[PDB]
Structures are given as C-alpha cells and as structure tokens.
Amino acid sequence: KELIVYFSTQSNNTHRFVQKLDAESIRIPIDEEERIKVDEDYVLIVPTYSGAVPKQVIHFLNDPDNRKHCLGVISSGNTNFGDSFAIAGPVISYKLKVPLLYQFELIGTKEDVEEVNRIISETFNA
Amino acid sequence: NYYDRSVSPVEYAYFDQSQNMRAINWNKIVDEKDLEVWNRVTQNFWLPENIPVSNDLPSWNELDDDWQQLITRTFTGLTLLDTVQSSIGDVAQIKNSLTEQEQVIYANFAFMVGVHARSYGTIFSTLCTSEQIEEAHEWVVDNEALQARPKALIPFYTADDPLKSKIAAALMPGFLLYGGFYLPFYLSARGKLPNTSDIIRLILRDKVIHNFYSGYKYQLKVAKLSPEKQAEMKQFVFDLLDKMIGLEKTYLHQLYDGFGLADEAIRFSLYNAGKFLQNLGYESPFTKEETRIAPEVFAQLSARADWDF
Ligand SMILES: Cc1cc2nc3c(=O)[nH]c(=O)nc-3n(C[C@H](O)[C@H](O)[C@H](O)COP(=O)(O)O)c2cc1C
C-alpha cells in the first residue's frame, strides 16, 4: 500500500533513485499531451528546474482527484544552485499544504535510499 | 528526410566529406534537453565586471600577507584550470556531438569558462598589488603538484577517443576546482570577501550544468556499447578518478600547508567527486565521514541544505 508518484526528465536521475527504493512507483508522463489518474495515497518525488516545479507535475497536481492523495513531497536537485537547491519541494509543500519530507541530489547516495525508505514507511503509518 | 542524407558542417570537416552539409535546425529538435540547457546557460549569462568586488577591501585588508598570497595563488590555480577547459577541453567536445544543438552549447561552455577565468583578474585588479599578482603566476608555473592535474587531462582532449575526452570534460567542472572553491566559502562563512563569494556562486551555477551536460551525453554514448565495453569504460572512469583524487590531495596538502584547511578542502573535493560519478550514472562509493564539511561553510554554497488552485 506504500506508493510513490514521481517525475523525471530524459536524464532519468529521479527515475533511477526511485527504482532503488522499496515502495511501488508510478511515473508522471514527460509528454504534456498525456496525464495519469492516481486513486491511492502516495509520496511525491520530483526534481527542480528554475517555474521551479516541472510543468508536467503542475498538470498532475492541477487535477483535484490526484492532489487530494498527496501525503507529502520529496524534492531533488543540486546544491550548486544555492538558494534554488530543491525548491520544488517547498513550493509544492506551500501549494498542497503537505509536509516537505526529504531533499536529495541527482540519483541519490546509499544514505538517501535508507532515509527515504524509512520516511515513506513512517509517513504511511503516521 | 534531408537530415538522414546530410551531415553537420563539423561532421563534414573532420569525419565524412562524402555527403552535403545541413544548416542547424532549431525548429525540429532531436533532444529537448539541449533546449533546456541552451536556454538556462544563455539566460544565466553574466560578467564579473558587473559584481562590485571593491566592498571586499575592508575584509581583504584585515587578512595578513600569508592569507592574501594563498587567495591570489589558489585563484591563479583555478584560472589555469579554466584556461585549459576554455582553450582546449570544451571546444574539443564540439566535433564529438550527438546533436546539432550540443555543438553550439559547447561553444557557450568554452566562452563562459573563459569568463570564469577572467573573473579572477577583476578580483585581483581591485584587491591585489602588481607583486602579489606576478608572484602567483610564478608559483603556478613552478608548482609541479599543480601542473600534474591539467597535464593528466589534456592528452584525452587531443587524442582520438571521444568518450575519454568526454569524461575529462566532465571531470574539470565536476571535481578538480572544488578544493580551491573551499577557500572563498571558508572566508565568507567568517564574513570575509563576501562579494568575491558571489562571483564563485555565479561560476558554480555554470559549472553544475557543464558537469551535468557532459555526463548526460557520456551516458547516451556508453548505453550503445556492449556490456563488456561498458564495464571497460567504468574501469577507466574510476582508474582516472583515483589518479586525479591522488594528484588533487597532493596539491591541496602543499597549497593549504600552514593554514590547516587541507583536510576539510579534500572532504569538499570528494563530496563533488561523488557528484561527478552520479552525473556519469555511477553510484557514489564515498562515506559520510570522507565527504562531511562544516555546515557554516556548506551554507555559503546552499542555505536550503499554470497553477489552477
Ligand atoms: C537546466 C537545469 C536547471 C536546473 N535547475 C535546478 C534548480 O533550480 N535547483 C536544483 O536544485 N537543481 C536544478 N537542476 C538539477 C536537477 O534538478 C538535477 O539534475 C536532477 O537530478 C534531475 O532529475 P531528472 O534527471 O529526474 O530530471 C537543474 C538542472 C538543469 C539541467
């Protein structure tokens, strides 16, 4: 019943991180002509591109049926962006009124996988 | 299709004169990621002559002649690395492009790394004497530990293996300069040379995308090779990273000798070595102990570490 909804561009950094996690995952389509419907609660995992939130994630969350099932957000990016590091998480947190659970870089480290696996378990029991 | 029966001019010039040349097409784009990167680096255009470094004079003047000389040498070290990547490294990538837009993006990289090198000159113009400036150039030329690093990457740029050239091109913005970038962040955590730190954050906002792009294009090419030749390329990456980590550790131990920074600077270096590996699609084998730096120093890098409703 642990579920992840994620977005990842052609570079597939977020995709590859999510595949290292235990929880089942559903991918938001890159093609803006395509949409998904999610009928179960989920943790959202998205990268940052600063329009800090990818347009395809806005389209996903713009469906009230989809955004009602969000149990919080994890955001990725690169610390070299400074004040812009992983700000997709905060922006989504404020819009949905849901907790920012974690922040990570590129395809994630061994530590990130352990902490996110734990935080997803604790988020679905809380 | 015109595209499949023609070559880019750079393909025509170096690899295949048998076909006619096609103009770049910005209306029909093979890879949308090229447009994302092109838009970002061009909209992020900046010049160091538009950052006021003269507000660093009060904090600069309070540093003794030991720290001043270290800043001038370190920055002159970074200038050399940028000069290598601008004159050799990034322009060498153009002919090995997968897409038409990639050729133009690497022309932007070459130019902008040139602006990075130039940014150190503007810092020196405002802060440093003629003597401090000239001493740093002598020191850079006569420092074998410093010279060894660029001397190890340059042959990959001039040789005929495009993937090893690509890994080298990713290694420069991804790893080699961070040991030096530690110093300005160290000082700006102590309220010293804060304007100088703004130029470094602008440089790194460019470096991060250079590293990502070269690593992304590396991954597209290795995916097409057999499992055997993929494992052989992974071997070369870690073998080269091992050699460059070795050379960098040696250099930093001499550079920071007496200032007691080397340890922290090397840990910062390996944090970015891990990021270099992730940008090429390999896991970071580095532990939290090997890559940890003081929060106050890391905060100088990043302080963070269509809608219908
Ligand atoms: C053009 C561009 C802009 C980016 N902007 C940001 C940013 O503002 N903040 C951040 O933390 N990371 C930023 N990143 C880094 C990406 O979020 C990071 O590479 C991420 O791992 C990509 O995930 P994906 O491969 O799933 O798309 C940017 C990367 C690119 C290429």
Short mmCIF file of C-alpha atoms and ligand atoms in Angstrom, two decimals:
data_model
loop_
_atom_site.label_atom_id
_atom_site.label_comp_id
_atom_site.label_asym_id
_atom_site.label_seq_id
_atom_site.Cartn_x
_atom_site.Cartn_y
_atom_site.Cartn_z
CA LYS A 1 0.00 0.00 0.00
CA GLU A 2 3.20 2.18 0.16
CA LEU A 3 3.09 4.12 -3.20
CA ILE A 4 5.42 6.75 -4.83
CA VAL A 5 4.33 9.17 -7.62
CA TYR A 6 7.47 10.70 -9.31
CA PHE A 7 8.50 12.87 -12.31
CA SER A 8 11.85 12.53 -14.17
CA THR A 9 13.09 14.22 -17.42
CA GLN A 10 15.03 12.49 -20.28
CA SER A 11 18.16 12.43 -17.96
CA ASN A 12 16.34 9.90 -15.63
CA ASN A 13 18.18 10.87 -12.34
CA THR A 14 14.94 10.86 -10.23
CA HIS A 15 13.69 7.71 -12.09
CA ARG A 16 16.91 5.78 -11.12
CA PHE A 17 16.74 6.99 -7.45
CA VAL A 18 13.07 5.87 -7.15
CA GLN A 19 13.97 2.37 -8.60
CA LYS A 20 16.48 1.92 -5.67
CA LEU A 21 13.55 2.43 -3.17
CA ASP A 22 11.30 -0.47 -1.92
CA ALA A 23 7.87 1.26 -2.40
CA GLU A 24 5.99 0.70 -5.73
CA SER A 25 6.23 3.77 -8.08
CA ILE A 26 4.08 5.44 -10.85
CA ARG A 27 5.78 7.85 -13.36
CA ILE A 28 4.15 11.20 -14.44
CA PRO A 29 4.45 11.35 -18.28
CA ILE A 30 7.08 13.69 -19.89
CA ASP A 31 4.73 14.12 -22.95
CA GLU A 32 2.45 17.09 -21.94
CA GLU A 33 -0.30 15.55 -24.21
CA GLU A 34 -0.58 12.70 -21.58
CA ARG A 35 -1.93 12.65 -17.96
CA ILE A 36 -2.39 10.00 -15.19
CA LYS A 37 -5.11 9.37 -12.53
CA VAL A 38 -3.93 8.08 -9.08
CA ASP A 39 -6.68 6.56 -6.81
CA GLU A 40 -4.39 5.68 -3.78
CA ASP A 41 -2.39 7.83 -1.25
CA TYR A 42 1.28 8.49 -2.34
CA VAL A 43 4.57 10.33 -1.55
CA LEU A 44 5.50 12.74 -4.45
CA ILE A 45 9.24 12.73 -5.54
CA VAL A 46 10.22 15.47 -8.10
CA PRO A 47 13.37 17.28 -9.34
CA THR A 48 13.80 21.12 -9.57
CA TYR A 49 14.22 23.30 -12.75
CA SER A 50 14.31 27.14 -12.14
CA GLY A 51 8.97 27.78 -12.71
CA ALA A 52 10.75 25.60 -10.05
CA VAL A 53 8.15 22.74 -10.35
CA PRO A 54 8.21 20.88 -13.72
CA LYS A 55 5.08 21.81 -15.81
CA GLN A 56 4.04 18.08 -16.02
CA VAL A 57 3.89 17.93 -12.13
CA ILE A 58 1.72 21.14 -12.06
CA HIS A 59 -0.63 19.45 -14.64
CA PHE A 60 -0.73 16.29 -12.40
CA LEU A 61 -1.50 18.28 -9.16
CA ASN A 62 -3.96 20.60 -11.06
CA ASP A 63 -6.34 17.54 -11.02
CA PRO A 64 -8.09 17.79 -7.58
CA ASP A 65 -8.60 13.94 -7.64
CA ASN A 66 -4.75 13.48 -7.81
CA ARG A 67 -3.56 16.22 -5.35
CA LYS A 68 -6.01 15.08 -2.56
CA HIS A 69 -3.98 11.79 -2.28
CA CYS A 70 -0.54 13.50 -1.65
CA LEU A 71 0.92 12.51 1.81
CA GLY A 72 3.87 14.98 1.35
CA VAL A 73 6.74 15.72 -1.11
CA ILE A 74 10.46 14.79 -1.54
CA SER A 75 12.46 17.14 -3.86
CA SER A 76 15.82 16.62 -5.67
CA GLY A 77 18.32 18.92 -7.44
CA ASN A 78 21.92 20.17 -6.93
CA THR A 79 23.33 22.32 -4.04
CA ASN A 80 25.36 24.35 -6.68
CA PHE A 81 22.04 26.26 -7.34
CA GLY A 82 22.36 27.77 -3.79
CA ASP A 83 19.02 29.43 -2.75
CA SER A 84 17.35 27.43 -5.64
CA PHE A 85 18.51 23.96 -4.32
CA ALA A 86 15.47 21.57 -4.42
CA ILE A 87 12.91 24.50 -4.08
CA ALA A 88 10.32 22.31 -5.97
CA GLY A 89 9.70 20.56 -2.58
CA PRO A 90 8.99 23.80 -0.63
CA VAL A 91 6.82 25.27 -3.49
CA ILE A 92 4.69 22.02 -3.63
CA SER A 93 4.58 21.95 0.27
CA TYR A 94 3.05 25.52 0.34
CA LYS A 95 0.52 24.88 -2.54
CA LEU A 96 -0.78 21.45 -1.28
CA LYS A 97 -0.37 22.29 2.49
CA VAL A 98 1.57 18.95 2.92
CA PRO A 99 4.95 18.23 4.62
CA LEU A 100 8.36 18.51 2.82
CA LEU A 101 9.74 15.09 3.95
CA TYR A 102 13.29 14.98 2.35
CA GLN A 103 15.76 16.66 -0.09
CA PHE A 104 18.46 14.79 -2.16
CA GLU A 105 20.88 15.12 -5.15
CA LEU A 106 20.91 13.51 -8.68
CA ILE A 107 20.48 9.66 -8.36
CA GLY A 108 20.90 9.74 -4.51
CA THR A 109 23.57 8.13 -2.24
CA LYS A 110 23.38 4.90 -0.11
CA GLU A 111 22.32 7.10 2.91
CA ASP A 112 19.43 8.81 0.94
CA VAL A 113 17.87 5.38 -0.02
CA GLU A 114 17.89 4.22 3.68
CA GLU A 115 16.35 7.54 4.97
CA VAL A 116 13.62 7.81 2.22
CA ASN A 117 12.67 4.07 2.63
CA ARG A 118 12.32 4.79 6.42
CA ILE A 119 10.50 8.19 5.93
CA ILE A 120 7.98 6.58 3.45
CA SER A 121 7.27 3.74 6.00
CA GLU A 122 6.81 6.31 8.87
CA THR A 123 4.68 8.65 6.61
CA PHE A 124 2.15 5.83 5.75
CA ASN A 125 1.85 4.74 9.48
CA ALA A 126 1.50 8.41 10.74
CA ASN B 1 14.30 13.32 -44.78
CA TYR B 2 17.06 15.93 -45.55
CA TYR B 3 18.60 15.16 -42.08
CA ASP B 4 19.31 11.41 -42.69
CA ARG B 5 21.06 12.12 -46.10
CA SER B 6 23.25 15.07 -44.86
CA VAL B 7 25.89 15.83 -42.13
CA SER B 8 26.53 18.83 -39.80
CA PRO B 9 29.43 21.02 -41.09
CA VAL B 10 31.74 19.80 -38.20
CA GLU B 11 30.94 16.14 -39.21
CA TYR B 12 31.75 17.09 -42.87
CA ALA B 13 35.01 18.85 -41.82
CA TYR B 14 36.61 16.09 -39.64
CA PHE B 15 34.86 12.70 -40.30
CA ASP B 16 32.86 12.47 -43.62
CA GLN B 17 33.23 14.71 -46.77
CA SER B 18 31.13 12.17 -48.81
CA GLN B 19 27.75 13.93 -48.09
CA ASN B 20 26.41 17.54 -48.37
CA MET B 21 26.05 19.71 -45.19
CA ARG B 22 22.77 20.68 -43.41
CA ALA B 23 22.14 24.02 -41.59
CA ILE B 24 21.33 23.64 -37.83
CA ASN B 25 17.52 23.14 -37.27
CA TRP B 26 16.20 24.93 -34.10
CA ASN B 27 12.52 24.32 -35.20
CA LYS B 28 12.86 20.44 -35.29
CA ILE B 29 14.95 19.47 -32.19
CA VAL B 30 16.24 15.83 -31.76
CA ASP B 31 16.69 16.22 -27.92
CA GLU B 32 14.53 18.70 -25.86
CA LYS B 33 17.19 18.50 -23.03
CA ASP B 34 19.52 20.53 -25.38
CA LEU B 35 16.88 23.36 -25.43
CA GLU B 36 16.53 23.26 -21.57
CA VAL B 37 20.38 23.54 -21.16
CA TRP B 38 20.83 26.15 -24.00
CA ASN B 39 18.03 28.42 -22.58
CA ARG B 40 19.45 28.14 -19.00
CA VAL B 41 23.19 28.86 -19.76
CA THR B 42 22.29 31.79 -22.15
CA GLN B 43 19.73 33.38 -19.69
CA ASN B 44 22.38 32.88 -16.90
CA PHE B 45 24.92 34.97 -18.94
CA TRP B 46 26.93 37.24 -16.54
CA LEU B 47 30.20 39.27 -16.45
CA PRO B 48 32.40 39.69 -13.33
CA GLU B 49 32.77 43.44 -14.23
CA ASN B 50 29.05 43.70 -13.10
CA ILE B 51 29.79 42.44 -9.49
CA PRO B 52 31.25 45.11 -7.12
CA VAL B 53 34.37 43.43 -5.55
CA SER B 54 35.62 46.82 -4.08
CA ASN B 55 33.33 46.21 -1.00
CA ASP B 56 35.76 43.30 -0.10
CA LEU B 57 38.65 45.82 0.55
CA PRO B 58 37.83 46.26 4.31
CA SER B 59 37.86 42.43 4.97
CA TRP B 60 40.77 41.82 2.47
CA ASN B 61 43.00 44.49 4.19
CA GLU B 62 42.45 42.77 7.63
CA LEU B 63 43.91 39.45 6.25
CA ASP B 64 47.73 39.25 6.81
CA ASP B 65 50.14 38.82 3.81
CA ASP B 66 50.04 34.97 4.31
CA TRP B 67 46.24 34.67 3.61
CA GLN B 68 46.35 37.31 0.77
CA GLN B 69 49.11 35.28 -1.04
CA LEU B 70 47.10 31.99 -0.53
CA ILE B 71 43.95 33.60 -2.10
CA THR B 72 45.99 35.01 -5.08
CA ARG B 73 47.78 31.62 -5.67
CA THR B 74 44.60 29.46 -5.27
CA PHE B 75 42.57 31.75 -7.64
CA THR B 76 45.55 31.81 -10.12
CA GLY B 77 45.47 27.96 -9.89
CA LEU B 78 41.71 27.97 -10.76
CA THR B 79 42.42 30.49 -13.64
CA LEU B 80 44.83 27.90 -15.21
CA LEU B 81 42.20 25.09 -14.98
CA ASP B 82 39.53 27.40 -16.57
CA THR B 83 42.09 28.45 -19.28
CA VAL B 84 42.62 24.69 -20.12
CA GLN B 85 38.83 23.94 -20.31
CA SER B 86 38.11 27.16 -22.36
CA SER B 87 41.00 26.91 -24.93
CA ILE B 88 41.20 23.04 -25.26
CA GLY B 89 38.59 20.96 -23.35
CA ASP B 90 35.13 22.39 -24.19
CA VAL B 91 35.90 23.24 -27.91
CA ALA B 92 37.23 19.62 -28.34
CA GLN B 93 33.68 18.35 -27.39
CA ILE B 94 32.01 20.18 -30.38
CA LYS B 95 33.12 17.69 -33.13
CA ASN B 96 32.06 14.64 -30.96
CA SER B 97 28.41 15.97 -30.62
CA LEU B 98 25.36 13.58 -30.78
CA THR B 99 23.06 16.54 -31.80
CA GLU B 100 23.36 19.88 -33.73
CA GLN B 101 22.41 22.00 -30.62
CA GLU B 102 25.16 20.27 -28.48
CA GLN B 103 27.81 21.83 -30.85
CA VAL B 104 26.51 25.38 -30.02
CA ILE B 105 26.11 24.61 -26.24
CA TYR B 106 29.85 23.57 -26.04
CA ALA B 107 30.78 26.88 -27.85
CA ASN B 108 28.84 28.63 -24.99
CA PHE B 109 30.67 26.46 -22.35
CA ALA B 110 34.11 27.41 -23.83
CA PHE B 111 33.18 31.16 -23.81
CA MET B 112 31.63 31.11 -20.26
CA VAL B 113 34.59 29.15 -18.70
CA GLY B 114 36.68 31.91 -20.37
CA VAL B 115 34.55 34.46 -18.40
CA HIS B 116 35.17 32.36 -15.20
CA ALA B 117 38.99 32.64 -15.76
CA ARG B 118 38.56 36.42 -16.47
CA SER B 119 36.54 36.89 -13.19
CA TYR B 120 39.73 36.16 -11.12
CA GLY B 121 41.55 39.02 -12.97
CA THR B 122 38.79 41.52 -11.88
CA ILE B 123 39.08 40.32 -8.21
CA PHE B 124 42.93 40.81 -8.43
CA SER B 125 42.56 44.27 -10.16
CA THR B 126 40.57 45.52 -7.08
CA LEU B 127 42.26 43.61 -4.16
CA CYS B 128 45.87 42.67 -5.20
CA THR B 129 49.17 44.57 -5.88
CA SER B 130 51.23 44.04 -9.11
CA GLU B 131 53.69 41.98 -6.96
CA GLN B 132 51.09 39.59 -5.36
CA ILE B 133 49.65 39.04 -8.92
CA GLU B 134 53.09 38.32 -10.55
CA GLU B 135 54.25 36.08 -7.59
CA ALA B 136 51.09 33.87 -8.03
CA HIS B 137 51.83 33.38 -11.80
CA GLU B 138 55.48 32.31 -10.99
CA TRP B 139 54.23 29.95 -8.20
CA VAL B 140 51.59 28.38 -10.59
CA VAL B 141 54.26 27.78 -13.34
CA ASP B 142 56.86 26.24 -10.91
CA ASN B 143 54.34 24.11 -8.86
CA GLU B 144 54.64 20.51 -10.29
CA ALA B 145 51.82 19.21 -7.98
CA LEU B 146 49.52 21.93 -9.53
CA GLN B 147 50.75 21.35 -13.16
CA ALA B 148 50.33 17.50 -12.89
CA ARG B 149 46.47 17.81 -12.72
CA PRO B 150 45.88 19.60 -16.10
CA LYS B 151 48.81 17.59 -17.66
CA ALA B 152 46.81 14.35 -16.90
CA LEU B 153 43.51 15.50 -18.61
CA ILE B 154 44.87 17.44 -21.69
CA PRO B 155 46.06 14.27 -23.59
CA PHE B 156 42.42 12.91 -23.52
CA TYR B 157 41.25 16.17 -25.28
CA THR B 158 43.90 15.88 -28.10
CA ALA B 159 43.65 12.01 -28.56
CA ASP B 160 41.05 10.25 -30.84
CA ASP B 161 38.81 8.55 -28.14
CA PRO B 162 35.72 10.83 -27.81
CA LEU B 163 34.33 9.09 -24.62
CA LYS B 164 37.62 9.55 -22.63
CA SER B 165 37.65 13.21 -23.91
CA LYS B 166 34.01 13.47 -22.61
CA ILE B 167 34.94 12.01 -19.13
CA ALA B 168 37.88 14.51 -18.88
CA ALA B 169 35.50 17.37 -19.96
CA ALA B 170 33.07 16.27 -17.15
CA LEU B 171 35.94 15.82 -14.58
CA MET B 172 37.08 19.54 -14.79
CA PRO B 173 33.77 21.28 -13.82
CA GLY B 174 32.71 18.20 -11.76
CA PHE B 175 35.71 17.78 -9.37
CA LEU B 176 39.11 19.49 -9.99
CA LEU B 177 38.32 23.11 -8.85
CA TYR B 178 36.26 22.44 -5.63
CA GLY B 179 39.40 22.00 -3.40
CA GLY B 180 40.16 25.66 -4.35
CA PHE B 181 36.48 26.86 -4.15
CA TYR B 182 36.53 25.68 -0.46
CA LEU B 183 38.75 28.74 0.44
CA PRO B 184 36.39 31.63 -0.58
CA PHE B 185 33.41 29.80 1.09
CA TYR B 186 35.58 29.23 4.25
CA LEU B 187 36.29 33.03 4.40
CA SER B 188 32.68 34.17 3.56
CA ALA B 189 31.39 31.97 6.47
CA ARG B 190 33.67 34.26 8.64
CA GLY B 191 32.20 37.41 6.93
CA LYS B 192 35.42 37.95 4.83
CA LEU B 193 35.44 38.55 1.00
CA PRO B 194 31.61 38.17 0.73
CA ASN B 195 31.35 39.87 -2.74
CA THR B 196 34.14 37.55 -4.09
CA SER B 197 31.90 34.61 -2.90
CA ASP B 198 29.04 35.95 -5.16
CA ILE B 199 31.35 35.57 -8.24
CA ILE B 200 32.16 31.95 -7.07
CA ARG B 201 28.38 31.12 -6.72
CA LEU B 202 27.86 32.52 -10.30
CA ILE B 203 30.81 30.35 -11.59
CA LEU B 204 29.35 27.20 -9.86
CA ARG B 205 25.82 27.95 -11.25
CA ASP B 206 27.55 27.48 -14.67
CA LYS B 207 29.90 24.57 -13.59
CA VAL B 208 26.97 22.41 -12.27
CA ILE B 209 25.26 22.46 -15.76
CA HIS B 210 28.60 21.89 -17.64
CA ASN B 211 29.17 18.73 -15.48
CA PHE B 212 25.52 17.53 -15.86
CA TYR B 213 25.55 18.03 -19.69
CA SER B 214 28.91 16.25 -20.37
CA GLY B 215 27.82 13.37 -18.05
CA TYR B 216 24.35 13.12 -19.72
CA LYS B 217 26.00 12.94 -23.22
CA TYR B 218 28.58 10.38 -21.92
CA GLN B 219 25.65 8.14 -20.69
CA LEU B 220 23.83 8.33 -24.10
CA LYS B 221 27.01 7.04 -25.91
CA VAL B 222 28.08 4.25 -23.42
CA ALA B 223 24.47 2.84 -23.43
CA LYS B 224 25.04 1.97 -27.18
CA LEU B 225 28.25 -0.09 -26.44
CA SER B 226 28.17 -3.83 -25.39
CA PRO B 227 28.05 -4.84 -21.67
CA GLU B 228 31.81 -5.80 -21.96
CA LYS B 229 32.91 -2.35 -23.38
CA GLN B 230 30.55 -0.59 -20.84
CA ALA B 231 32.41 -2.32 -17.90
CA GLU B 232 35.77 -1.34 -19.57
CA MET B 233 34.66 2.39 -19.67
CA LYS B 234 33.53 2.21 -15.97
CA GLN B 235 37.04 0.80 -15.12
CA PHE B 236 38.75 3.77 -16.93
CA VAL B 237 36.46 6.32 -15.08
CA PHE B 238 37.37 5.03 -11.55
CA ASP B 239 41.06 4.46 -12.57
CA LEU B 240 41.23 8.13 -13.80
CA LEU B 241 39.21 9.45 -10.78
CA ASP B 242 41.67 7.53 -8.47
CA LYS B 243 44.70 9.16 -10.24
CA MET B 244 43.06 12.68 -10.18
CA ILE B 245 41.98 12.33 -6.45
CA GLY B 246 45.64 11.33 -5.71
CA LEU B 247 47.09 14.36 -7.62
CA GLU B 248 44.46 16.75 -6.06
CA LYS B 249 45.16 15.52 -2.44
CA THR B 250 48.96 16.06 -3.01
CA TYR B 251 48.33 19.60 -4.47
CA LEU B 252 45.90 20.72 -1.69
CA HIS B 253 48.25 19.45 1.12
CA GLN B 254 51.01 21.81 -0.30
CA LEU B 255 48.58 24.70 -1.17
CA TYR B 256 46.97 24.80 2.34
CA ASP B 257 50.22 23.89 4.26
CA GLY B 258 50.30 26.13 7.41
CA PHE B 259 46.59 27.22 7.09
CA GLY B 260 45.20 23.83 8.32
CA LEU B 261 42.38 23.70 5.68
CA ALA B 262 43.66 20.73 3.53
CA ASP B 263 41.54 18.08 5.39
CA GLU B 264 38.18 20.00 5.04
CA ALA B 265 39.06 21.09 1.43
CA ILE B 266 39.82 17.41 0.44
CA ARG B 267 36.47 16.26 2.02
CA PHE B 268 34.66 19.02 -0.01
CA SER B 269 36.61 17.72 -3.08
CA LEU B 270 35.36 14.10 -2.55
CA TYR B 271 31.72 15.29 -1.92
CA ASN B 272 31.98 16.72 -5.51
CA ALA B 273 33.88 13.57 -6.75
CA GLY B 274 30.75 11.63 -5.66
CA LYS B 275 28.53 14.12 -7.59
CA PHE B 276 30.86 13.76 -10.67
CA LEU B 277 30.26 9.94 -10.54
CA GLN B 278 26.41 10.36 -10.21
CA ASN B 279 26.38 12.78 -13.25
CA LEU B 280 28.06 9.94 -15.31
CA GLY B 281 25.45 7.42 -13.96
CA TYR B 282 27.66 5.59 -11.36
CA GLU B 283 26.90 5.35 -7.58
CA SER B 284 29.00 7.38 -5.05
CA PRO B 285 31.18 4.93 -3.04
CA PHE B 286 32.29 7.79 -0.68
CA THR B 287 31.18 7.60 3.02
CA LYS B 288 29.57 10.46 5.06
CA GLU B 289 32.89 10.83 7.05
CA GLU B 290 35.00 11.25 3.82
CA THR B 291 32.62 13.95 2.37
CA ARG B 292 31.44 15.90 5.52
CA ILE B 293 32.29 19.66 5.81
CA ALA B 294 31.22 22.25 8.46
CA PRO B 295 27.57 23.40 7.98
CA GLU B 296 28.56 27.16 8.15
CA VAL B 297 30.87 26.53 5.08
CA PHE B 298 28.21 24.39 3.25
CA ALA B 299 25.56 27.14 3.90
CA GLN B 300 27.78 29.54 1.80
CA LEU B 301 27.25 27.05 -1.12
CA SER B 302 23.47 26.46 -0.43
CA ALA B 303 21.41 27.76 2.59
CA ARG B 304 18.47 25.40 1.62
CA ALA B 305 20.56 22.31 2.69
CA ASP B 306 -0.15 27.33 -14.87
CA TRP B 307 -1.24 26.55 -11.22
CA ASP B 308 -5.11 26.20 -11.20
CA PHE B 309 -5.51 26.31 -7.34
C1 LIG C 1 18.64 23.45 -16.89
C2 LIG C 1 18.70 22.88 -15.50
C3 LIG C 1 18.20 23.59 -14.44
C4 LIG C 1 18.24 23.09 -13.15
N1 LIG C 1 17.72 23.82 -12.09
C5 LIG C 1 17.85 23.40 -10.79
C6 LIG C 1 17.45 24.22 -9.72
O1 LIG C 1 16.96 25.34 -9.85
N2 LIG C 1 17.64 23.71 -8.44
C7 LIG C 1 18.18 22.49 -8.16
O2 LIG C 1 18.31 22.09 -7.01
N3 LIG C 1 18.56 21.71 -9.22
C8 LIG C 1 18.41 22.12 -10.52
N4 LIG C 1 18.84 21.32 -11.58
C9 LIG C 1 19.40 19.97 -11.32
C10 LIG C 1 18.38 18.86 -11.49
O3 LIG C 1 17.25 19.03 -10.63
C11 LIG C 1 19.05 17.52 -11.20
O4 LIG C 1 20.00 17.27 -12.24
C12 LIG C 1 18.08 16.34 -11.10
O5 LIG C 1 18.77 15.20 -10.59
C13 LIG C 1 17.46 15.99 -12.43
O6 LIG C 1 16.42 14.99 -12.23
P1 LIG C 1 15.84 14.18 -13.51
O7 LIG C 1 17.03 13.51 -14.17
O8 LIG C 1 14.87 13.19 -12.91
O9 LIG C 1 15.18 15.22 -14.39
C14 LIG C 1 18.80 21.82 -12.91
C15 LIG C 1 19.32 21.09 -13.99
C16 LIG C 1 19.28 21.58 -15.26
C17 LIG C 1 19.85 20.77 -16.39
#
